[PDB]
Amino acid sequence: MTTEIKKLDPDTAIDIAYDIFLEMAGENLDPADILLFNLQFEERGGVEFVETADDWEEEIGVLIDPEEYAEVWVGLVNEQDEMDDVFAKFLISHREEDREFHVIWKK
């Protein structure tokens, strides 16, 4: 505690979000997309931890503060390691006070 706003570690953020994709990924997600994720995810696993953006107030339906939120994208990648097929994106409030985590399924 040397500042006011603290971010989350790469492995830490991914860890939490990862568990959220395993527990959340259900009815909220499209059926067909659920299956594919079940058959192809191990060999084609994708979970890139991106940052916030300005073009947020369009998809989720609410403006978000940039460089102040943890953006997580969990999709399916190839053997070349990429991220062109995202399944669900999560947004976790970096800060400790108030934990606003809202994931988006098939936009």
Curated annotation (Swiss-Prot):
Q: Name one Pfam family in it.
A: DUF440
Kindly give the Gene3D superfamilies that the UniProt entry links to this protein: dsDNA mimic, putative
| Superkingdom classification of source | Bacteria
Q: How does it assemble?
A: Monomer in solution. Interacts with the DNA-binding protein HU.
Q: Domain remarks in the entry?
A: Contains many negatively charged residues, which are arranged in winding patterns on the surface similar to the charge distribution seen in dsDNA. The secondary structure elements are arranged in an alpha-alpha-beta-beta-beta-beta order with the two alpha helices packed against the same side of an anti-parallel four-stranded beta sheet.
Of which family is this protein a member? Answer: Belongs to the putative dsDNA mimic protein family.
Its biological function? May act as a double-stranded DNA (dsDNA) mimic. Probably regulates the activity of the DNA-binding protein HU.
HAMAP family, alphabetically? Put_dsDNA_mimic
Q: What is this protein called?
A: Putative double-stranded DNA mimic protein HI_1450
